[PDB]
């Protein structure tokens, strides 16, 4: 056990310990690793290579700005990875490529404006993808193939539309967060999101400390009128960015 942390069973608790770096002494037997709520500014390559039994890894609420390539490649049994509330500016290609059993991925509250094109291609069992509070301008490629998603959080980004058909195979969705985006309702491309929301009013959620069903929470930029109320006649292909 790291001297700054407490350990019990296969759980290592390094949460809220004012840590500036990942401490030594985490047993290779560890299955749950709390490193959240610290001041970790970077993760060294190979730091997780020894921890092949991890199933849940909490790196949220730190000061991470980048991740080295291959950082997680040994964590083949990982099912939850939390990276929210950091300062991640970009991700390397294949950063999640080996996390084939991952079920929950937290990326909200970073500085991401795009993702590598194949970032989710191997996450065939993913159920929750929460990426609020970044600066995304397009739906990341690959999300349309995460057919097992129950939770998809895209709120508080910079999305203007959703590519046609992107949500149609996400038939297990129960929670979709779309508020806080500047949806461009004069552009003809908004019609897919409009049509999809109108058919899935029960799964569009707002957030006041918790999920609250609100299909009007996806709002048009400027008028702040509901996206699902847009008429096609009011839109035009020539009014798109």
Ligand X SMILES: CC(=O)N[C@H]1[C@H](O[C@H]2[C@@H](O)[C@@H](CO)O[C@@H](O[C@H]3[C@H](O)[C@@H](O)[C@@H](O)O[C@@H]3CO)[C@@H]2O)O[C@H](CO)[C@@H](O[C@@H]2O[C@H](CO)[C@H](O)[C@H](O)[C@H]2O)[C@@H]1O
Binding site for ligand X (CB under 6 A): 16, 37, 60-61, 82, 84, 106, 108, 130, 132, 153, 155, 177, 207
Nearest distance in Å: CB 3, ligand X: 20
Rounded distance between C-alpha atoms, residue 46 and residue 143, angstroms: 29
Tell me the C-alpha to C-alpha distance, in Å, between residue 163 and each of 91, 93, 191, 192: 22, 23, 10, 7
Rounded distance between C-alpha atoms, residue 65 and residue 112, angstroms: 10
Q: Which is nearer to ligand X, 72 or 177 (CB)?
A: 177
Nearest distance in Å: CB 186, ligand X: 26
Rounded distance between C-alpha atoms, residue 157 and residue 165, angstroms: 20
User: What is the SS3 string spanning 8-77?
Assistant: ECCEEECCCCCCCCCCCCCCCCCCEEECCCCCCCCCCCCCCCCCCCCCEEECCCCCCCCCCCCCCCCCCC
Rg (C-alpha) for the chain, rounded Å, is 19
Q: Which is nearer to ligand X, 28 or 39 (CB)?
A: 39
Question: Nearest-CB residue to ligand X?
Answer: 132
Nearest distance in Å: CB 154, ligand X: 8
* Three-class SS state of 158: coil
Nearest distance in Å: CB 15, ligand X: 6
Q: Which is nearer to ligand X, 1 or 80 (CB)?
A: 80
Nearest distance in Å: CB 175, ligand X: 7
Q: Which is nearer to ligand X, 149 or 230 (CB)?
A: 149
Q: Which is nearer to ligand X, 131 or 230 (CB)?
A: 131
């Amino acid at each position: 056990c790291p001297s700054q942390c407490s350990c019990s069973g296969t759980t290592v608790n390094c949460k809220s310990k004012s840590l500036a770096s990942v401490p030594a002494g985490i047993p290779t037997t560890t299955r749950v690793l709390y490193l959240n709520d610290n001041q970790i500014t970077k993760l060294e390559p190979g730091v997780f290579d020894r921890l092949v039994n991890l199933q849940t890894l909490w790196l949220n609420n730190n000061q991470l700005t980048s991740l080295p390539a291959g950082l997680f490649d040994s964590l083949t049994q990982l099912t939850i990875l939390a990276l929210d509330s950091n300062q991640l500016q970009a991700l390397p290609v294949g950063v999640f490529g080996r996390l084939v059993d991952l079920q929950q991925l937290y990326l909200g509250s970073n500085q991401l404006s795009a993702l590598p094109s194949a970032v989710f291609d191997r996450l065939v069992h993913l159920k929750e993808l929460l990426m609020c509070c970044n600066k995304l301008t397009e739906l990341p490629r690959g999300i349309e193939r995460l057919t097992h998603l129950t939770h998809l959080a895209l709120d508080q980004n910079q999305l203007k539309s959703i590519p046609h058909g992107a949500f149609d195979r996400l038939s297990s969705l129960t929670h979709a967060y779309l508020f806080g985006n500047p949806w461009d309702c004069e552009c003809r491309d908004i019609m897919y999101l409009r049509n999809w929301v109108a058919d899935h009013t029960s799964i569009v959620m707002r957030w006041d400390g918790k999920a609250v069903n609100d299909p009007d929470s996806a709002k048009c930029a400027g008028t702040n009128t509901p996206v699902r109320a847009v008429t096609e006649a009011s839109t035009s292909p020539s009014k798109c960015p």
